[PDB]
C-alpha cells in the first residue's frame, strides 16, 4: 500500500472508535447537567479522561502520515486536525507553568470584589456589579464601580498577563507560527484552487476593509446617543467629544442595549410583545417547540426525531433535581439530538426555541460527514444560521399567521424605527468594540506594542476607533483588557465580528430567493422551499470544504460583504442622518478631566547644569507628594478644612519623554469630585516656594502654565 492508502485505513478505524468514545462522554455530561450531584460529576470526569487518552494516542500515530504525500483533500484535512501539537511543544516546566497561570487568572476574575468607597461593609461580586451597571443612572455610582473593578482586579492580572503572552508566543513558534495572534488567525485559513484559498494575513485586510464600510453608520448612531446622554447627564458630556466609558450601559461598553430607555426615538409607541396572547391562548413549552418544528418543515428541512421529543429537557424539573437552565443544543452522536432549556411561556423563549432548533438542524445536516469534519465551515457559521431563523420568526408577518397578533393589527412606521434603533444598539454599537479589542491583542502578541505602552495604546485606540474616553488616566500598572471575561480566560474574540457580517449575507440571499419586496427587516422565509434548499446545500457540507466555498453556495460570493448589513439598517441610517445634521463625528482631544488640568514643564539642564538629575519615576512621586502637601495647606488655611490629600489623589497624564505632563487633584473620599483648577492654582502659588526648593528649581525652570 501507499501512504495515502494507509492513511485511509487509519482514519476509517479512528473515526469509528472516536464516535463510540465521544458518545459515552456526551451521555455522562448530559446526565450531570440535568441532575447535578457528586456521583454524576465523577462519572463525567472519568468518561472525559478516557476520551482524552484515546485522542492523544491517535494524535501521535497520525504523525506517521506526511501531508506532502497525500493528494486526497478529505484525508489531508483530517490528518492536519489530528497532527496538531499545541502545548506539547513546551518543556514540562513551561507547560505546567502556563496551565497554572491560566487557572490563576480565571480565579481572580470570578472571585473579584469591589467595595463602596464610602461604605466599607457594602461589597459586591461581579454579578452584583454588572446588575448595577445595567440599570444605574447615577454618574457617581457608575464611576466608582467602573474604576473599582479596573483597580481591584485589573492590577492583579497585569503581571500574569505579561508572563502569559511570553509563554503563548513560545508555544505558537513551536507550532511553526509567527506568534500567538498568527496562531489564532489560522482558524480562517483554507487552501484550494481558484479563489477558494485564504491566507492568515488576508483576515487582517478583510476586517479593516469591513470596518471602514461600517464606520459611517456607527458615527450616526454615536452622534445620536451622545445627544441623548447629554440630557441624562447635564454638563458631563461634550457635544463634539467622545463618550465617557462608564456611561455606556454595562461594565465594558460592549453593548449599548441598556441605553434604549434613554435613546428610544418615539417613546409613545411600544414594540410588539405577544407574551400576554400566548398565556391567554394557553400555550406551553411543548407547543412552542412544536411550532418551531412546523416553521422548519415549511421550508423543506427535517422533523425532530421520536427520541428528541422524549430525551430532551424542555422545562425546568419539579422533582427536586438541580439543573443549569442556560439553553443549549446538543449533538451526542449516534443520531442522538437533544435540547436542554427551561422554557417559559414568553415571546423571548419563543424566539429562543427557534434559535436552538436551528443548531439542531445544522447538526443533523452534516451528520453524514466523517467524525472530524462534523462541524461548521467556520467558528461563526453555527451562530449565523441560528440568528437568521430568529429574525424571520419575529416578524409581524409571522406572528399574524400564528394567531399571536391581531390580523387587523395596523402598521406603524414609528414603531419600525424604534425596532431598528434597538437592534442597532446591540448589532452595530458592538462592532467597533470587537474590532478594536482584537486589533490590540494581535499587536501585543506580535510585538508592535511594547509592554511600556500597553495602556497608552489601549486608550489611544479607544478614542480613535470607538469614540470612548476614560473618566480617569491610567498608567501601566493597569491592564484594562484583562478585566473582560474573554481576555482573562484565553478566548478569541473576532468570531463575533465575522458572525455578524455572515448573518446578514445569509439573510439577504435567502430573501431574494423567496422574492421578498420591501425593507429587509420585514423579510420572512417561511413556506419558501427554494430558500430552504439553497440553505440545506450549504449546511450539509460541514467543514469538508473551504468556508469560502460554503459561503458561495448560499450568498453566491467568496468574500465577506458589509453591504447586506448596511442595507438592513438603511431606513434607520436615513432617519438618523436627517436628524443629526452636521453634528456627526468626534474629536479625541476632550476628556472628562481635561478642562481643569494644569500643564507643567520642567527644564533641569538649564536649572542645575552639571548638577542636573534625571526626572525618573521617583521624582514624579515626589512631585505628586508635594502637590498633595500644597493642597492640604491651602484648604486648612483658606477653608478651615482638614483634608488628607495623598500623592494617590494627584492624577498625572500625557507624560512625555521630556519633562512635560498634566495633572489634576481629586478628593480623598470622592473620585467624581475634581478640585476646581482655580483652587489648585491658588494652592500651588501659596506653597510655590517649597515646591521650588524640593527640586532645586526656580520660577523659570519650573513652569506651571496659567500661573
Amino acid at each position: 500500500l501507499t501512504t495515502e492508502e494507509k492513511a485511509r485505513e487509519f482514519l476509517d478505524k479512528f473515526n469509528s472508535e472516536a464516535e463510540n468514545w465521544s458518545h459515552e462522554s456526551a451521555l455522562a455530561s448530559w446526565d450531570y447537567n440535568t441532575n447535578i450531584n457528586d456521583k454524576n460529576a465523577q462519572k463525567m470526569n472519568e468518561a472525559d479522561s478516557k476520551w482524552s487518552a484515546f485522542y492523544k494516542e491517535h494524535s501521535k500515530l497520525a504523525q506517521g502520515f506526511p501531508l506532502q504525500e497525500i493528494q486526497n483533500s478529505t484525508i489531508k484535512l483530517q490528518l492536519q486536525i489530528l497532527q496538531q501539537n499545541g502545548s506539547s511543544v513546551l518543556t514540562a516546566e513551561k507547560s505546567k507553568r502556563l496551565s497554572t497561570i491560566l487557572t490563576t487568572m480565571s480565579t481572580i476574575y470570578s472571585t473579584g470584589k469591589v467595595c463602596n468607597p464610602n461604605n466599607p461593609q457594602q461589597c459586591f461580586t461581579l454579578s452584583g456589579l454588572e446588575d448595577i451597571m445595567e440599570k444605574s443612572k447615577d454618574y457617581h455610582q457608575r464611576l466608582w464601580i467602573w474604576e473599582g473593578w479596573r483597580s481591584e482586579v485589573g492590577k492583579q492580572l497585569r503581571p500574569l498577563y505579561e508572563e502569559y503572552v511570553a509563554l503563548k508566543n513560545e508555544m505558537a513558534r513551536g507550532n511553526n507560527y509567527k506568534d500567538y495572534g498568527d496562531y489564532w488567525r489560522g482558524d480562517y485559513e483554507t487552501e484550494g484552487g481558484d479563489g477558494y484559498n485564504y491566507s492568515r494575513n488576508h483576515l487582517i485586510e478583510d476586517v479593516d476593509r469591513i470596518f471602514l464600510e461600517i464606520k459611517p453608520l456607527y458615527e450616526q448612531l454615536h452622534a445620536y446617543v451622545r445627544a441623548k446622554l447629554m440630557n441624562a447627564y447635564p454638563s458631563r458630556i461634550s457635544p463634539t467629544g467622545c463618550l465617557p466609558a462608564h456611561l455606556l450601559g454595562d461594565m465594558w461598553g460592549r453593548f449599548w442595549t441598556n441605553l434604549y430607555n434613554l435613546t428610544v426615538p418615539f417613546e409613545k409607541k411600544q414594540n410588539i410583545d405577544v407574551t400576554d396572547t400566548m398565556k391567554k391562548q394557553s400555550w406551553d413549552a411543548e407547543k412552542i417547540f412544536k411550532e418551531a418544528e412546523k416553521f422548519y418543515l415549511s421550508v423543506g428541512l427535517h422533523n425532530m426525531t421520536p427520541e428528541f421529543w422524549n430525551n430532551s429537557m424542555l422545562t425546568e424539573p419539579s422533582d427536586g433535581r438541580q439543573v443549569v437552565c442556560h439553553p443549549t443544543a446538543w449533538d451526542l452522536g449516534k443520531n442522538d439530538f437533544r435540547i436542554k432549556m427551561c422554557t417559559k411561556v414568553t415571546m423571548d423563549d419563543f424566539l429562543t426555541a427557534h434559535h436552538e432548533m436551528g443548531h439542531i438542524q445544522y447538526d443533523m445536516a452534516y451528520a453524514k460527514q466523517p467524525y472530524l469534519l462534523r462541524n461548521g465551515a467556520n467558528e461563526g457559521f453555527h451562530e449565523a444560521v441560528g440568528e437568521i431563523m430568529s429574525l424571520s420568526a419575529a416578524t409581524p408577518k409571522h406572528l399574524k399567521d400564528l394567531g399571536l397578533l391581531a390580523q387587523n393589527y395596523p402598521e406603524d412606521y414609528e414603531t419600525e424605527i424604534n425596532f431598528l434603533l434597538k437592534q442597532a444598539l446591540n448589532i452595530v454599537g458592538t462592532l467597533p468594540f470587537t474590532y478594536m479589542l482584537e486589533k490590540w491583542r494581535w499587536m501585543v502578541f506580535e510585538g508592535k506594542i511594547p509592554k511600556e505602552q500597553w495602556m497608552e495604546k489601549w486608550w489611544e485606540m479607544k478614542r480613535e476607533i470607538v469614540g470612548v474616553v476614560e473618566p480617569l488616566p491610567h498608567d501601566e500598572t493597569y491592564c484594562d483588557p484583562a478585566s473582560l471575561f474573554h481576555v482573562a480566560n484565553d478566548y478569541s474574540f473576532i468570531r463575533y465580528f465575522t458572525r455578524t457580517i455572515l448573518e446578514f449575507q445569509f439573510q439577504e440571499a435567502l430573501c431574494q430567493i423567496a422574492n421578498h419586496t420591501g425593507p429587509l427587516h420585514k423579510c420572512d422565509i417561511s413556506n419558501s422551499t427554494e430558500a430552504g434548499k439553497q440553505l440545506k446545500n450549504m449546511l450539509e457540507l460541514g467543514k469538508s470544504k473551504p468556508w469560502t466555498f460554503a459561503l458561495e453556495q448560499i450568498a453566491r460570493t467568496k468574500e465577506m460583504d458589509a453591504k447586506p448589513l448596511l442595507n438592513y439598517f438603511k431606513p434607520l441610517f436615513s432617519w438618523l442622518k436627517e436628524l443629526n445634521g452636521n453634528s456627526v463625528g468626534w474629536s479625541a482631544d476632550w476628556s472628562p478631566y481635561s478642562e481643569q488640568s494644569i500643564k507643567v514643564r520642567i527644564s533641569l539642564k538649564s536649572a542645575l547644569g552639571e548638577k542636573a538629575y534625571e526626572w525618573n519615576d521617583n521624582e514624579m512621586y515626589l512631585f505628586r507628594s508635594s502637590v498633595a502637601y500644597a493642597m492640604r495647606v491651602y484648604f486648612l488655611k483658606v477653608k478651615n478644612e482638614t483634608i488628607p490629600f495623598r500623592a494617590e489623589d494627584v492624577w498625572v497624564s500625557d507624560e512625555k519623554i521630556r519633562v512635560s505632563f498634566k495633572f489634576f487633584v481629586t478628593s480623598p473620599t470622592n473620585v467624581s469630585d475634581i478640585i476646581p483648577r482655580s483652587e489648585v492654582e491658588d494652592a500651588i502659588r501659596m506653597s510655590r516656594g517649597r515646591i521650588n526648593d524640593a527640586f532645586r528649581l526656580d520660577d523659570k525652570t519650573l513652569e506651571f502654565l496659567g500661573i
Binding site: 418615539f266 409607541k269 395596523p410 412606521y413 438603511k570 432617519w575
Partner: protein
C-alpha cells in the same frame, strides 16, 4: 360604465350579459386572459376599470414590474379573469373623455409630527392586490391630476389616525401623461 368622468388607476371603479355586445363600443388594441378562455366567458360578474393609455398596455400584463401594479392597481387572479385594453369616444354614449392620464409613481410613509416630520423613501406603501391604495396615497393622485403639473409631489393626511390619536402622514409623487389616441378615451378593464 359609460357615464361621468373616467376613474383613474388610484381610484378605479368597481361594479358587481352579452359579452360580444359589450365588445362593440370599444376598439380593442390588446386582449389576454388568465385561468380562462374568452369563449367560456361568453358561454357573480365583477368589472373593475380605470383610465389608462393603450400605448402603455404592456404594464397591464401579469409579471409587470411597472408603477401601475405597485402603487395604483393590482389584480389577484384568484378567480377566472380577462384583461381588455381598448378605446372609444364616450361623449356620444352619455359620458366624457379625459384630457390626460394620472398615476401614482411613488408613495411612502413619514414618522413624527411637524415641525419634526421626517419622510423616508425606505418605507414604501404598496397597493395590495384586489384593494384600493390608502386614502392618503389616493389624495396625492387626485391633487396631482388637478394641479396642472407633470410631476406633482406632496405630503398629505386623510383621516388616518394611529394608536395614540395622531395623524398618519404619507408622501408621494403623481405623474400626468398626455393621451396617445386623438379624441378618444383610453380605458383598461379587468373582468372576473
Amino acid at each position: 360604465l359609460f357615464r361621468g368622468p373616467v376613474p383613474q388607476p388610484y381610484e378605479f371603479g368597481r361594479l358587481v350579459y352579452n359579452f360580444t355586445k359589450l365588445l362593440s363600443y370599444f376598439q380593442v388594441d390588446a386582449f389576454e386572459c388568465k385561468k380562462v378562455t374568452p369563449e367560456s366567458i361568453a358561454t357573480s360578474l365583477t368589472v373593475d376599470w380605470f383610465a389608462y393609455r393603450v400605448a402603455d398596455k404592456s404594464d397591464l400584463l401579469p409579471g409587470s414590474s411597472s408603477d401601475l401594479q405597485r402603487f395604483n392597481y393590482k389584480p389577484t387572479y384568484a378567480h377566472p379573469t380577462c384583461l381588455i385594453s381598448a378605446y372609444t369616444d364616450l361623449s356620444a354614449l352619455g359620458g366624457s373623455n379625459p384630457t390626460n392620464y394620472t398615476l401614482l409613481t411613488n408613495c411612502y410613509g413619514c414618522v413624527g409630527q411637524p415641525p419634526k416630520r421626517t419622510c423616508l423613501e425606505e418605507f414604501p406603501s404598496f397597493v395590495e392586490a384586489g384593494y384600493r391604495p390608502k386614502p392618503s396615497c389616493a389624495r396625492i393622485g387626485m391633487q396631482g391630476h388637478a394641479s396642472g403639473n407633470e410631476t406633482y409631489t406632496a405630503v398629505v393626511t386623510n383621516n388616518e389616525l394611529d394608536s395614540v390619536g395622531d395623524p398618519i402622514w404619507r408622501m408621494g409623487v403623481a405623474q400626468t401623461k398626455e393621451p396617445s389616441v386623438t379624441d378618444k378615451a383610453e380605458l383598461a378593464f379587468f373582468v372576473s
